[PDB]
C-alpha cells in the first residue's frame, strides 16, 4: 500500500511560507538512517511545496519519507499536521485498534476514561448506555462500538486518558 | 466532535487588549503536558486574537487547546470567559447532567437547594410545584424537569449549592 | 435568568464618590469564596462605576457578583442600596412570598402585625377589612391579598414585625 | 442563471481588512456538504478579496458558493451584507413574493402590519388608502401594490412583522 | 524550580501607577552584580508592568530578577509587596522552617513568644494547650504543630518576637 | 557532535524584531578571530532569523558560530538567551559537573550554599537530609545526588553562591 505522495502534499499545503522556510531549514540537520543521502542546499532553499513533495519521495522512500516528514513536523511543534499525516499514512488504524483485545481484557479504571471523554466526544445517551453495563469488559465492549464514527483526535484523547490513568498498562503494551 | 476553533475565537475576541497581552504573557510560563512544544517569544508577542487562535489550534489540538485556554483564563481570574468556553466545548452538558441518576437518588437536603435557587432561577409557581412533591426523589425529579431551559450559570449555581450543602456526596461523585 | 449587570450598575451609580472609594477599598479585604481570584490594586484603585461594574461581572459571575456587592454594601452600612439590589436580583420575590402557606398556617398574633403596619402601609379600609375576618387564617389570607401593590420596604417592615412578634417561627422557617 | 461572481465580489469588497481576516479564518471550520473539498491553509491565509472571490467560485459552484458565503456572513453577525447578497443572488424575489396568494388569502391582522410599517415605509396617503379598503383581502391586495417600489430591507421588515403577529401562518407556509 | 514570571507579574501588578514610575526610576541606580547589564533609559521610561516583567526576566534570570525586585521594593518602603514576592519565590518555606530543630532545641523564653502571638494569631484554646506543656522543648513542639495553617505574616511576626527576645540566638542562626 | 544549528535557531526565534536589528548591528563590529571574514552590510541588514541562522552557520562553523552568538547575546544583556544557548551547545554539562571531584574534596562552607539554595531549589526534606550528613564531603556527596533533576538556572545559582562564598577555589579551578 502506497499513495502516500498525496498525503505528504496535503500535509505540506496546510502551512504558510514562514513555516515552509523553517521546515526546509530543519530538513538540513535532521538525523538520518544509514544508507540515505541528504538534499543539497543549492536546490533545497528554492523549492516550493510541490517540488519539495516529489523531492522527498525520490530521495527517501515513501514510507521513510512520510515518517521523516511527520518527525520533522512534530519537532517544529505542529501537532495537528503530524497527526493528520500519521492518520493518512497509517489508514484509519490507531493504537487502540491494534491492542483492542488487550485493552478490553486488562483495563480497570473505566470511569476515568468515561469522565475524560464525556461531553467532548460521547453524548449523554451513549454515556448512560456505557455506564449501564455490569462489568468492565462489558463496558469496554460497549464503548468500542462507537469507535468507527470517531476521528484521529478523539482516539488520541482516549489514548491520553488511558496513559494518565494507567501508565503501566500502556508501557507494557508498548513492549 | 470538533468546532473548537470557533469557541476559542469567541472566548479570545470578548476580552480587551490589556487582558490579551496578559494572556499572551502568561502563555509563556504555563505548565505543559509532555510531548507539546512552546510558542516562541518572537511571534507570540505580536499576534492578535485571530493569529493567536490559529496558532493555539496549530500547536495544540482542539481538545487540549481549549483545555489550556480555559485553564489560563481561569488563572487570570476571568471566570465568565472560562465558563463560556467550557459550555461551548462540552456542548450543553454539565456536571449535574452526568450524575443525574445518582443525584436523584442520594441527595437529602433539597430545601436548601430550593432556597438557594429561589427567585434568581426558579419562579414562584415552579417553587410551589417542587415543594408539593412528597418525597426527596420525587422533588429532585420535578426539579430536573426545568433544567433544559437553564444556562451554564444556573447549573453552576446549583452545583455550588450542592457543594455547600453536602460536600461529601460531591467529592464522592467526582472520585 | 440574568440581567444582573443593570442591577449592579444601578446600585453602584446611586452612591457618591467618597463612599465609592470606601467600597473599592473594602473590596480588597472582603472574604472570598473558594475558587475566585482577587482584583489587583493597580487597576482597582483608579476605575469609576462603569468600569467597576464590568470588572465585577467579569471576575465573578452575575449571581456571585451581585451577592458579593450586596454583602459589601451591607458591611458599609448602606441598607438602602443593598436592599434595592437584593430586590432587583431576586425579582419581586420576598421571604414572605416563599413561605406564604406556612405563614398563613402557623402565625398566631395577627393583631401585632396589624398594629405595626397600620398607617405606614395599610390604610383604614384595609385595616377594617382584615379586622373583620373571623379567624387567624382568614385574616392572613385577606392581608396577603394586598401584597402585590407593595414594594420591598413594606415587606421588610412586615418581616421585622414578624421577627419581633414570633422569633421562633421565623428561625424555624429559615432553617 | 449565473452572475454570482459580481454579487460575491460586491459582498466581499464592502468589508474591512480585520473582518476579512475573520471571514478567512471562519472559512476553515464551516461545515461542508458531501463531495466538496476544503481550501488549504497555505493559500487561504494570504489571498485578498479579489483572489478569494475567484477561489470560492472555483472550489464551490456559484449557487453553493453564494449560499456558503451568506451562511458564513450570518455566522459572523454581519446581517446587512448577507441580506444584500441574498437580494443579489435571488434577484428581486422575496419570501412574500413567492407566497403572495396565500398571504393575501390567509392573513387576518392587517392593522398590526400597517402599524409596524407606518412611517418607516408607508406614507400617510398610502396608509389611508389601505385603511379605506373594506375587507382583509382587499387591504392586502392594495398593500401589495406598493411592493415593487420597495427594497430588501422593507420586505424583511414586513416579514418580521408577519412572523411576530401570526407565527403559525409563517411556519405553515415555510413548511 | 521556576515560574518566577507569575510572582513578578503579581508583585508589579498590585502597585499603583505613580509608584510604578518610582520603581522604574530607582531601577536605574540600584547596584548590580558582576556580569549583568543595565536596562537603557530609552525603553525603560515608557514600559508598563507587562513589558517590565518580561524585560526583567530577560535581562536578569528568574532567581536574580526576583531577588532584585524584592530588594528594590524593600528600598522603596513597600514591605507588604516585598514580603508577598519573597513568599511566592521561596514557596511556603520560611526562616523558622529552616531552623526548626535548632529553634525547638535552643530557645528558652517561650512565654514572651506566646504573649506576642496571643490573640493576633493564636486562639484561646490552643494557647492554653501550648501552656499546658511541661518543658520548653515540648512547648515548642506543640506550638510548631499550628504552623502549617499560618501565612507569611504570622511567621514574620514570630521571627520579630524571637529577635526581640533572643537576639544572640538568631544572629548565631543566620551566621 | 554538532546539531548547533537547531540551538542557534531556537535562540534567535525567542527575541523580538526590535532586538533582532540590534543583534544584527552588533554583529557588524564584534571582534573576530583570525581567518574569519565579516558578513557584508548589503545582505545582513535585510535577513530574518532563518536566513541569519543559515548565514551564521555558513561563514562561521557550528562551534565558533554558537560561541560568537552567545558572546553577542550576553553583550546585549540578554543573559537568559545566552544561558539557554550555552546549555544546548554544551549538552547537560555544567561547570560543577566538570569539577565534581574537586568541589566535593575542597569546599568548606557548605552551610552558605545550603542557605542560598534553600526554598528556591531544595525542598525541606532534601535540606534536612543534606544537613543530617556528618562531614563536609558526605554533605556534598548527598547534595550532588539531586543535581540530575536540576536545570541550567539552578546550577548557575549554585555556581554564583560558591563564587560569593569562597572565590579563591573558583578562580583556582578555572585556571
From Swiss-Prot, chains A, B, C, D, E, F:
There is a cross-link at residues 55, 155 (Glycyl lysine isopeptide (Lys-Gly) (interchain with G-Cter in ubiquitin)). The gene is PYCARD. This is Apoptosis-associated speck-like protein containing a CARD. Changing residue 47 to A/N/Q: Abolishes homooligomerization. It comes from Homo sapiens (Human). The CARD domain mediates interaction with CASP1 and NLRC4. Keywords: Apoptosis, Cytoplasm, Endoplasmic reticulum, Golgi apparatus, Immunity, Inflammasome, Inflammatory response, Innate immunity, Isopeptide bond, Membrane, Mitochondrion, Nucleus, Phosphoprotein, Tumor suppressor, Ubl conjugation. One of its GO terms (biological process) is defense response to virus. In breast tumorigenesis, methylation-mediated silencing may affect genes and proteins that act as positive mediators of cell death. Changing residue 41 to A/Q/W: Abolishes homooligomerization. PROSITE patterns: CARD (PS50209), DAPIN (PS50824). Residues 92-175 form the CARD domain. Widely expressed at low levels. Detected in peripheral blood leukocytes, lung, small intestine, spleen, thymus, colon and at lower levels in placenta, liver and kidney. Very low expression in skeletal muscle, heart and brain. Expressed in lung epithelial cells (at protein level). Detected in the leukemia cell lines HL-60 and U-937, but not in Jurkat T-cell lymphoma and Daudi Burkitt's lymphoma. Detected in the melanoma cell line WM35, but not in WM793. Not detected in HeLa cervical carcinoma cells and MOLT-4 lymphocytic leukemia cells. Changing residue 56 to A: Abolishes homooligomerization.
Amino acid at each position: 500500500m502506497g499513495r502516500a505522495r498525496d498525503a505528504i502534499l496535503d500535509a505540506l499545503e496546510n502551512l504558510t511560507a514562514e513555516e515552509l522556510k523553517k521546515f526546509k531549514l530543519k530538513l538540513l540537520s535532521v538525523p538520518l538512517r544509514e544508507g540515505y543521502g541528504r538534499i543539497p542546499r543549492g536546490a533545497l532553499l528554492s523549492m516550493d511545496a510541490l517540488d519539495l513533495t516529489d523531492k522527498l519521495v525520490s530521495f527517501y522512500l515513501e514510507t521513510y519519507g512520510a515518517e521523516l516528514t511527520a518527525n520533522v513536523l512534530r519537532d517544529m511543534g505542529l501537532q495537528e499536521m503530524a497527526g493528520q499525516l500519521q492518520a493518512a499514512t497509517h489508514q484509519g488504524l490507531h493504537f487502540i485498534d491494534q491492542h483492542r483485545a488487550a485493552l478490553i481484557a486488562r483495563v480497570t479504571n473505566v470511569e476515568w476514561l468515561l469522565d475524560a471523554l464525556y461531553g467532548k466526544v460521547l453524548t449523554d445517551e451513549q454515556y448512560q448506555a456505557v455506564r449501564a453495563e455490569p462489568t468492565n469488559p462489558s463496558k469496554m465492549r460497549k464503548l468500542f462500538s462507537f469507535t468507527p464514527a470517531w476521528n484521529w483526535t478523539c482516539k488520541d484523547l482516549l489514548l491520553q486518558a488511558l496513559r494518565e490513568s494507567q501508565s503501566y498498562l500502556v508501557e507494557d503494551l508498548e513492549r
